[PDB]
């Protein structure tokens, strides 16, 4: 259905260390196909997906010197909030930057987006309309003034429900294989009796892509998230995901629970049970 | 494709 | 040759529509300019056109297809005074270089 | 071009004459330019400079000379004059990254004769 492609910019000062640590990193929904470390070797936007390394010389001359300029304006930026909040020159602060754009199913424009954090938390944030600003405190309002005589709104605008879905849709079809693919959960549920009284029930969510599921538990019907543990879906490092939950029954009972499992590459959802 | 118009804060 | 422009010289009367045609080869191009430099003068710049469909100013019409990479200026009722070599500007970023094509001298007749 | 001022308006030189011509900006630009216009060759980009302090060269840097010690000015030296020199120049200035106006706008022009 929905696509995306999304850009993340972290920049860390380095107080009596020298230049700021600046990572730059780009997805197209849970795929990250392009990387920049100021601390890797070659100092250029790197591949990390094999459809993006057909893209020829003019394309990554081009994204080095503009992924530059981003960390340049972070470079400043580290220099300028810490004059806004009169903080000293004897601490690390942190930058983040995250913009990109939402296409449908008929892969056309949905939403464009553009927030930008310090020290991890809101600053300044691009409004839905893409014309407008939210700025966070009274420091961030200062930026936005800026940012209005600077026509940064507009630029993003232009990029954003243009250049931005354009060439995520170029992507799309260069990564048939790899982006369009939908990957169904192999699924299995476990039991571990920690004690005599009560029993544990696992289930599992294991192979995904992509990395959106819904893994929840019940009681004969009834929606049970009382006795919960869900941990956060992590990668398994092959470009597929895992998740499992957890409750903690008192046993004898363990007929009357059920997992349900919900993801995109299910044609129907899952129930589970253990006997 | 980034964005090609970075301003500073 | 990044960009290349419509040879010249174009001919119109006055009251009529001069249309210049500009294709350019970088892909990953995001700013697109029309730039009127009258002769023994300097460019002087008219319109700036940023994303993808058609931007109207007075007498001016740009036009942009980023598919088929392809830039366009229309110039409705002219006047003689519309006598300048006309030249097409492209670049993709805030530090790219900005990547002119040759110009197509545009003479209107009274 | 209420930004973008050069001196001078007009040069004649001979063989090996130094002369520098003056380029000011008024809008806060980092990113400035030397362009040189000819016949043949359309525009060409002599030197550039993205900041103060700091500059690079273009496609034809040769015989020419360049510094940007202020955000303001981005002079152009031309060392010893040669005949090939003979062109109008072209003072240029983009904001780079103090806003995301996308416009270069460009100074009015020097016209330079080297003569024998």
């Known amino acids: 259905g929905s696509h995306s492609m999304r850009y993340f910019f972290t920049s860390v000062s380095r107080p009596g260390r020298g230049e700021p640590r600046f990572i730059a990193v780009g997805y197209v929904d849970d795929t990250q196909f392009v990387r920049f470390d100021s601390d890797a070797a070659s100092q250029r936007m790197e591949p990390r997906a094999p459809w993006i390394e057909q893209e020829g010389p003019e394309y990554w001359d081009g994204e080095t010197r503009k992924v530059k300029a981003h960390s340049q304006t972070h470079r400043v930026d580290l220099g300028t909030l810490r004059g806004y909040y009169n903080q000293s020159e004897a601490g690390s602060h942190t930058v983040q930057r995250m913009y990109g754009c939402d296409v449908g199913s008929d892969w056309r424009f949905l939403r464009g987006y553009h927030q930008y954090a310090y020290d991890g938390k809101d600053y300044i944030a691009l409004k839905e309309d893409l014309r407008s600003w939210t700025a966070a405190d009274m420091a961030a309002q200062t930026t936005k003034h800026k940012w209005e005589a600077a026509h940064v709104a507009e630029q993003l605008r232009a990029y954003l429900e243009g250049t931005c879905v354009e060439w995520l849709r170029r992507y799309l079809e260069n990564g048939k294989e790899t982006l369009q693919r939908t990957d169904a959960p192999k699924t299995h549920m476990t039991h571990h009796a920690v004690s005599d009284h009560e029993a544990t029930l696992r289930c599992w969510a294991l192979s995904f892509y992509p990395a959106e599921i819904t893994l929840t538990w019940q009681r004969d019907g009834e929606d049970q998230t009382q006795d919960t543990e869900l941990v956060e879906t992590r990668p398994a490092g092959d470009g597929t995901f895992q998740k499992w939950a957890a409750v903690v029954v008192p046993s004898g009972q363990e007929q009357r629970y059920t997992c349900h499992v919900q993801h995109e590459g299910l044609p129907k959802p899952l129930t589970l049970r253990w006997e | 494709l980034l964005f090609g118009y970075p301003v500073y804060v | 040759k990044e960009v290349e422009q419509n040879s010249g010289p174009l001919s119109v009367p006055e009251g009529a529509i001069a249309s210049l045609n500009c294709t350019y080869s970088?892909?990953?191009?995001?700013?697109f300019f029309w730039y009127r430099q009258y002769s023994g003068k300097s460019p002087e710049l008219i319109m700036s056109?940023?994303?993808?469909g058609d931007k109207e100013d007075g007498r001016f019409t740009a036009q942009l297809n980023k598919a088929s990479q392809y830039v366009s200026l229309l110039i409705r009722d002219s006047q003689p005074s519309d006598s300048a070599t006309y030249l097409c500007?492209?670049?993709?970023?805030?530090?790219?270089?900005?990547?002119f094509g040759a110009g197509t001298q545009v003479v209107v007749t009274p | 071009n209420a930004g973008v001022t050069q001196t001078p308006k007009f040069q004649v030189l001979k063989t090996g004459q130094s002369m520098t011509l003056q380029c000011a900006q008024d809008?806060?630009?980092?990113?400035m330019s030397w362009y040189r216009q000819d016949p043949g060759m359309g525009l060409r980009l002599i030197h550039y400079?993205?900041?103060?302090?700091?500059?690079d060269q273009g496609e034809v840097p040769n015989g020419y000379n360049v510094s940007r010690s202020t955000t303001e000015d981005f002079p152009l030296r031309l060392l010893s004059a040669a005949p090939s020199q003979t062109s109008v120049y072209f003072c240029?200035?983009?904001?780079?990254?103090?806003?995301?106006?996308?416009?270069?706008?460009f100074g009015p022009g020097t016209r330079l004769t080297v003569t024998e």
């Open positions: 240029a200035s983009r904001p780079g990254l103090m806003s995301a106006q996308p416009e270069q706008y």
């Open positions: 970088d892909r990953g191009s995001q700013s």
């Open positions: 056109i940023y994303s993808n």
């Open positions: 500007a492209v670049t993709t970023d805030s530090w790219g270089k900005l990547q």
């Open positions: 809008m806060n630009h980092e990113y």
């Open positions: 400079s993205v900041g103060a302090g700091i500059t």
